[PDB]
Amino acid sequence: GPIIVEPHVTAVWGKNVSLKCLIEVNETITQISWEKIHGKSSQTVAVHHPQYGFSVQGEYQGRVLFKNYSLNDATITLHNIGFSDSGKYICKAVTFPLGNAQSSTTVTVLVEPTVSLIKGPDSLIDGGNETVAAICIAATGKPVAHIDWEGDLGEMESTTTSFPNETATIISQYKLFPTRFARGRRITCVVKHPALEKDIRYSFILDIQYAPEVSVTGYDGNWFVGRKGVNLKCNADANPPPFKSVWSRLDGQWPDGLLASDNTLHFVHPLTFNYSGVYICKVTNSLGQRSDQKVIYISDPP
Amino acid sequence: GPIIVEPHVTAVWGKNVSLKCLIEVNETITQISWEKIHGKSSQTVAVHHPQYGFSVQGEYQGRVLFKNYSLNDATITLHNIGFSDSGKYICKAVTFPLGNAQSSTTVTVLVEPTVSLIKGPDSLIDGGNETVAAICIAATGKPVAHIDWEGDLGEMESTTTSFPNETATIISQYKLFPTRFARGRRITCVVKHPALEKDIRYSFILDIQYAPEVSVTGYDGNWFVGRKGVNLKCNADANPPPFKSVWSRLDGQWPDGLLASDNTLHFVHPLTFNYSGVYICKVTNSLGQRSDQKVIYISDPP
Ligand SMILES: *[C@@H]1O[C@H](CO[C@@H]2O[C@@H](C)[C@@H](O)[C@@H](O)[C@@H]2O)[C@@H](O[C@@H]2O[C@H](CO)[C@@H](O[C@@H]3O[C@H](CO[C@H]4O[C@H](CO)[C@@H](O)[C@H](O)[C@@H]4O)[C@@H](O)[C@H](O[C@H]4O[C@H](CO)[C@@H](O)[C@H](O)[C@@H]4O)[C@@H]3O)[C@H](O)[C@H]2NC(C)=O)[C@H](O)[C@H]1NC(C)=O
Ligand SMILES: *[C@@H]1O[C@H](CO[C@@H]2O[C@@H](C)[C@@H](O)[C@@H](O)[C@@H]2O)[C@@H](O[C@@H]2O[C@H](CO)[C@@H](O[C@@H]3O[C@H](CO[C@H]4O[C@H](CO)[C@@H](O)[C@H](O)[C@@H]4O)[C@@H](O)[C@H](O[C@H]4O[C@H](CO)[C@@H](O)[C@H](O)[C@@H]4O)[C@@H]3O)[C@H](O)[C@H]2NC(C)=O)[C@H](O)[C@H]1NC(C)=O
Ligand SMILES: *[C@@H]1O[C@H](CO)[C@@H](O[C@@H]2O[C@H](CO)[C@@H](O[C@@H]3O[C@H](CO[C@H]4O[C@H](CO)[C@@H](O)[C@H](O)[C@@H]4O)[C@@H](O)[C@H](O[C@H]4O[C@H](CO)[C@@H](O)[C@H](O)[C@@H]4O)[C@@H]3O)[C@H](O)[C@H]2NC(C)=O)[C@H](O)[C@H]1NC(C)=O
Ligand SMILES: *[C@@H]1O[C@H](CO)[C@@H](O[C@@H]2O[C@H](CO)[C@@H](O[C@@H]3O[C@H](CO[C@H]4O[C@H](CO)[C@@H](O)[C@H](O)[C@@H]4O)[C@@H](O)[C@H](O[C@H]4O[C@H](CO)[C@@H](O)[C@H](O)[C@@H]4O)[C@@H]3O)[C@H](O)[C@H]2NC(C)=O)[C@H](O)[C@H]1NC(C)=O
Ligand SMILES: *[C@@H]1O[C@H](CO)[C@@H](O[C@@H]2O[C@H](CO)[C@@H](O[C@@H]3O[C@H](CO[C@H]4O[C@H](CO)[C@@H](O)[C@H](O)[C@@H]4O)[C@@H](O)[C@H](O[C@H]4O[C@H](CO)[C@@H](O)[C@H](O)[C@@H]4O)[C@@H]3O)[C@H](O)[C@H]2NC(C)=O)[C@H](O)[C@H]1NC(C)=O
Ligand SMILES: *[C@@H]1O[C@H](CO)[C@@H](O[C@@H]2O[C@H](CO)[C@@H](O[C@@H]3O[C@H](CO[C@H]4O[C@H](CO)[C@@H](O)[C@H](O)[C@@H]4O)[C@@H](O)[C@H](O[C@H]4O[C@H](CO)[C@@H](O)[C@H](O)[C@@H]4O)[C@@H]3O)[C@H](O)[C@H]2NC(C)=O)[C@H](O)[C@H]1NC(C)=O
Ligand SMILES: *[C@@H]1O[C@H](CO)[C@@H](O[C@@H]2O[C@H](CO)[C@@H](O[C@@H]3O[C@H](CO)[C@@H](O)[C@H](O)[C@@H]3O)[C@H](O)[C@H]2NC(C)=O)[C@H](O)[C@H]1NC(C)=O
Ligand SMILES: *[C@@H]1O[C@H](CO)[C@@H](O[C@@H]2O[C@H](CO)[C@@H](O[C@@H]3O[C@H](CO)[C@@H](O)[C@H](O)[C@@H]3O)[C@H](O)[C@H]2NC(C)=O)[C@H](O)[C@H]1NC(C)=O
Ligand SMILES: *[C@@H]1O[C@H](CO)[C@@H](O)[C@H](O)[C@H]1NC(C)=O
Ligand SMILES: *[C@@H]1O[C@H](CO)[C@@H](O)[C@H](O)[C@H]1NC(C)=O
């Protein structure tokens, strides 16, 4: 076309926008205008003369600048978009003598959301009813921002409310039946929105609590009378960390010749036909006490 | 209005026309255009710059001039109208920085007729069937010229044929039962047409022929024997003029003591009891012979 401009542009709230316009005609140029039309009425915006400088109209006076001082780039950046810039703007080029041609660009206003991740309120213990683990918030976005979680470990869901301003807020609530096998999993809501030159992401690790989980190693196949220096450790994974890890013998009695370094159980005396009892360590955290036992047998070969 | 121009103007074929346009705005002016639009396409006509002179477009190049060298009278005379100037022309004023406003004027083409009066072909004798006395011709007028006769002495009538060119010719035939009492009457067709700043008229006198019309004066009440020096003139009005005006006595006989000076009849001898006859002069023209007589009586008192 005689005047080439890109149409259907989109400008971001509060930020600026470059309204490119170029006029490569072997014709000699005498005036250069920009006009936003309110309906059938043409409010002028910017004007460039080769003799009588520039002109910027009220109320655009502060918020428009000419990117090029040449008679050829009608290119202008509109400083600081508001809502009311949503319309059709035409670039009027006056030549001598063809008259004037015009090209239009329709700019739609577009406002960013502001995102937030918020820890769901109830704590996530093991094997309990569905719980809300996290809420992702895309605030006052126009158009409605969009949302998506990457965990495939539970269920998305969202309620979205919209405004007079012709923007909206959606809130995605991520929920799961919590299991300890999901300890420290990365939950992450991505939010995709037109005005996001690169979509924005917010991340989480799951903190699932659970009851203690205990397992004593130490007893290999057979323990023979007089075997010297063998142990039992009360290995246990729990969250929160536990506090109590008492090392009781189920047969109420408890012989000497034992000690409980760390939570290992030492038999610092060589083995006797004593000791022949079912040993049980009992580990306790915020969520309660759990225990495991190893049936200890002392034997002797021919 | 911002730009004041007169609308719905009418331009006369072959002649010129002034397209007035004036732009009294306290705004400073930067370009001045005239554009005839063919449908939705704007062929520029004239352009005025305060720096880079004038411009006249093809093919208007010869036929347009700027009536005012000022930046304020877009007034132009379009030299030599043809048919194809029948349309809407707009005057474009470019200011700095309002942009541009425009006012339109719709010029309809209008061609003069050319008028003629032509003597109807058959001659007008007296008391004959209606005859066509004159034909008035309004030729190739656009729109159809109009016609009217002023004589109230017969009947108008007209046949009007129209053309491709979107002009027409009407021919009014004026007809009457001709009577001699209408000799030398002014018949006149007026032709009224939009393009005639003062309507045009063509005039005629009627030339009605007639048979001769005769009347002898001379005989007063009584003529007495011996009365000295009395005459009879053969007064007669006819058209065409007559040629023969013989002065015969109906009683075949014709005494001496008479003479026919001019067409008076002298009795140069004092009256006798002769002369006592019915005297008749016979007048003859193109249309034939007519006559009148006076019964002459000579008497004598006691
Ligand atoms: C296990 O969790 C189950 C789901 O709970 C979830 O997890 C929690 C932590 C949150 O994250 C929450 O968002 C999750 O949904 C839970 O099962 C649920 O039990 C409750 C009842 O105790 C149900 O709520 C009731 O829902 C009905 C729905 O009625 C219909 O219409 C509504 C629209 O209004 C639709 O949305 C529904 O699909 C239905 O078609 C309500 O009518 C009802 O309202 C009541 O309270 C109002 C108060 O004004 C009264 O006026 C009414 O008369 C009712 O009494 C309840 O809100 C819930 O729907 C149900 N299932 C689900 C899938 O949510 C279960 O309790 C947990 N297991 C336990 C505790 O053992
Ligand atoms: C006295 O003058 C009378 C009128 O003549 C006028 O004066 C002359 C000098 C011219 O200026 C002339 O323009 C004036 O009109 C005259 O009376 C007329 O006599 C003739 C016949 O001798 C009539 O002509 C005939 O008219 C008829 C009309 O028929 C109808 O249709 C036509 C349309 O076609 C209408 O216009 C009429 O109103 C009727 O409704 C014709 O049909 C006819 O055509 C004939 O000739 C063609 C030749 O192809 C044949 O095909 C047909 O068969 C016909 O034979 C005639 O043309 C005339 O109308 C009539 N009256 C008037 C008012 O004109 C009269 O003769 C004179 N007195 C004398 C000579 O003693
Ligand atoms: C879209 O367009 C907008 C604005 O057109 C751009 O954002 C602009 O960013 C500039 C640069 O930061 C802003 O101008 C800055 O103003 C600062 C504040 O001025 C002072 O006012 C008085 C001065 O006495 C005091 O209150 C105080 O000193 C304030 O600072 C200046 O400080 C900045 O000066 C800078 O330049 C000078 C010149 O060398 C340096 O000496 C300084 O170190 C400093 O770098 C500057 O002038 C402007 O206000 C912003 N406009 C806004 C907010 O709308 C966007 O960047 C642009 N967007 C894109 C993507 O292009
Ligand atoms: C179209 O329509 C919607 C709905 O009306 C607008 O959304 C509102 O936007 C404004 C501004 O973004 C929001 O108002 C802000 O509230 C903040 C909350 O402050 C705290 O205290 C409140 C209690 O009242 C708590 O709820 C909250 O958690 C916070 O702890 C204020 O901090 C903001 O004020 C800030 O700016 C001012 C001026 O610069 C400073 O003086 C302050 O110090 C502070 O920094 C502000 O008032 C409002 O909450 C939004 N409503 C929503 C999201 O529902 C959209 O703005 C509008 N869209 C467009 C594009 O204009
Ligand atoms: C609408 O506009 C039209 C034209 O624009 C007007 O009509 C014009 O009338 C002018 C004046 O008569 C015409 O121009 C005249 O041309 C004549 C012919 O030029 C010569 O060409 C060569 C020269 O060597 C020879 O064949 C021969 O000499 C021809 O004459 C000139 O003779 C005229 O000269 C006159 O001015 C000079 C200057 O002083 C005098 O010395 C002379 O004595 C003489 O007066 C003259 O230049 C023009 O052609 C017409 N245009 C046409 C026909 O379209 C209408 O009047 C106007 N209508 C209205 C109502 O405004
Ligand atoms: C739209 O349409 C109509 C219909 O076609 C046009 O009307 C014609 O117009 C032209 C020009 O006016 C007329 O043609 C002229 O004829 C004249 C007649 O000359 C004599 O000889 C003829 C025999 O052929 C006799 O019938 C007649 O009585 C004359 O005795 C010519 O003299 C004209 O030529 C003249 O100009 C040329 C060039 O300048 C010179 O060289 C000559 O010497 C001479 O001066 C001319 O040819 C024609 O008769 C019209 N037809 C009609 C009236 O039915 C309209 O012109 C048109 N309308 C418009 C606005 O353009
Ligand atoms: C205002 O607009 C003009 C014209 O659009 C911009 O012109 C830049 O001018 C330079 C030099 O005149 C052009 O680059 C040339 O590239 C050759 C490489 O062969 C180099 O040798 C020259 O030195 C020169 O750099 C360039 O085409 C042109 N840029 C554009 C986008 O057209 C100018 O940048 C603009 N000014 C401002 C302040 O924005
Ligand atoms: C071109 O257009 C101009 C402006 O329309 C025409 O201006 C004529 O200029 C004269 C003098 O400048 C004006 O008349 C003034 O009248 C007073 C009477 O008080 C007299 O004292 C001055 O000497 C002068 O004559 C007049 O207003 C103006 N005419 C019009 C129609 O506006 C000018 O005539 C045009 N030029 C040509 C060549 O057509
Ligand atoms: C085992 O220890 C107990 C202490 O309760 C002691 O009375 C008993 O004699 C011991 N038995 C053996 C075989 O060492
Ligand atoms: C009248 O004149 C005639 C000539 O024809 C003549 O014979 C006669 O005598 C005259 N009569 C009188 C009274 O004069």
Residues of chain B in contact with residue A28, where contact means CB-CB under 8 angstroms, are 52
Contacts for A67-74: CB closer than 8 Å, 24+ residues apart: A67/A18, A71/A29, A71/A32, A72/A22, A72/A23, A72/A24, A72/A29, A73/A20, A73/A21, A73/A22, A74/A19, A74/A21, A74/A22, A74/A23, A74/A32, A74/A33, A74/A34, A74/A46, A74/A48
A299: nearest Cα among A227, A212, A196: A227
- For ligand 6, say whether the CB of B29 is within 6 Å of any of its atoms: no
Q: What is the resolution of this structure in A?
A: 3.9
Q: Which amino acid is at B41?
A: S
How far away, in angstroms, is B40 Cα from ligand 1 center? 66
Alpha-carbon gap: A200 to the closest alpha carbon of chain B (Å): 44
Domain boundaries, chain A: 1-111, 112-210, 211-302
How far away, in angstroms, is B79 Cα from ligand 5 center? 13
**CATH class in words for B112-210:** mainly beta
Q: Which of A42, A55, A94 sits opposite B31 (nearest CB)?
A: A94
- Say if strands A114-119 and A158-162 run parallel, antiparallel, or are unpaired: unpaired
Give bridge partners of residue B186 from the DSSP assignment. B205
Alpha-carbon gap: A135 to the closest alpha carbon of chain B (Å): 53
Q: Do A31 and B98 touch (CB under 8 A)?
A: no
Contacts of A83 (CB under 8 A, 6+ apart): A13, A109, A165, A166
Q: Which amino acid is at A175?
A: K
Contacts of A252 (CB under 8 A, 6+ apart): none
Judged by a CB distance cut-off of 8 A, whether residue B273 touches chain A is: no
Maximum alpha-carbon separation in chain A: 123
The architecture that CATH gives domain B1-111 is Sandwich (2.60)
DSSP string spanning B197-248?
Answer: SS-EEEEEE----EEEEE--B---S-EETT--S-EEE--EEEESPPSEEEEE
CB A177 within 8 A of CB A130: yes
- For ligand 6, say whether the CB of B111 is within 6 Å of any of its atoms: yes
CB B295 within 8 A of CB B250: no
Contacts of A220 (CB under 8 A, 6+ apart): none
Contacts of B158 (CB under 8 A, 6+ apart): B147, B170, B171, B172, B173
- Closest ligand 7 atom to residue A68 Cα is 1
Taking the C-alpha atoms of residue A130 and residue A154, their distance in angstroms, rounded to an integer, is 9
* Chain position carrying tokens 């005689």: A2
How far away, in angstroms, is A136 Cα from ligand 4 center? 18
- Integer angstrom CA distances of residue A283 from A186, A279, A293: 28, 13, 12
Kindly provide the residue ranges of all beta strands, DSSP E only, lying in B20-130, ordered along the sequence. Answer: 29-38, 41-48, 54-56, 64-66, 76-78, 87-95, 99-110, 114-119
* DSSP-derived 3-state class of residue B96: coil
> Which of B267, B274, B296, B299 to probe ligand 10 with, by most ligand atoms within 8 A of CB?
B274
Q: Do A33 and B97 touch (CB under 8 A)?
A: yes
Contacts for A271-277: CB closer than 8 Å, 24+ residues apart: A271/A223, A271/A224, A271/A225, A271/A226, A271/A227, A271/A228, A271/A230, A271/A298, A272/A225, A272/A226, A272/A298, A273/A225, A273/A298, A277/A249, A277/A250, A277/A251, A277/A253
Q: Which residue of B has its CA nearest to A91?
A: B99
Contacts of B208 (CB under 8 A, 6+ apart): B124, B125, B126, B178, B179, B180, B182, B183, B239
- For ligand 9, say whether the CB of A274 is within 6 Å of any of its atoms: yes
Taking the C-alpha atoms of residue A131 and residue A207, their distance in angstroms, rounded to an integer, is 12
Structure tokens at A65: 């600048």
Q: Which amino acid is at A22?
A: L
Taking the C-alpha atoms of residue B82 and residue B180, their distance in angstroms, rounded to an integer, is 49
In this structure, is the dihedral angle defined by the CA atoms of residues A271, A272, A277 and A282, taken in order, positive or negative? negative
Taking the C-alpha atoms of residue A203 and residue A236, their distance in angstroms, rounded to an integer, is 29
CB B189 within 8 A of CB B173: no
| Residue B262: other Cβ atoms inside 10 A | 9
| Residue B112: other Cβ atoms inside 10 A | 21
What residue ranges line ligand 8, CB within 6 angstroms? B 67-68, 70, 73
CB A115 within 8 A of CB A191: yes
Q: Which residue of B has its CA nearest to A54?
A: B97
What residue ranges line ligand 1, CB within 6 angstroms? A 129-132, 175
A244: nearest Cα among A260, A225, A226, A266: A260
Taking the C-alpha atoms of residue B217 and residue B214, their distance in angstroms, rounded to an integer, is 10
Q: Which ligand is nearest to the CA of A66?
A: 7
Specify the experimental method.
X-ray
* Chain position carrying tokens 């809130």: A171
Which of the residues B30, B51, B64, B95 would you substitute to probe the A interface, choosing the one with the greatest number of A C-beta atoms within 10 Å?
B30
Taking the C-alpha atoms of residue A15 and residue A191, their distance in angstroms, rounded to an integer, is 20
Structure tokens at A288: 């309660």
Give bridge partners of residue A186 from the DSSP assignment. A205
- Closest ligand 2 atom to residue B175 Cα is 11
CB B27 within 8 A of CB B97: no
DSSP string spanning A169-183?
Answer: EEEEEEEE---GGGT
A147: nearest Cα among A163, A171, A167, A131: A171
* DSSP-derived 3-state class of residue A64: strand
Residues of chain A in contact with residue B49, where contact means CB-CB under 8 angstroms, are 30, 96
Q: Do A100 and B100 touch (CB under 8 A)?
A: yes
The architecture that CATH gives domain A211-302 is Sandwich (2.60)
Q: Do domains A1-111 and A112-210 have the same CATH topology?
A: yes
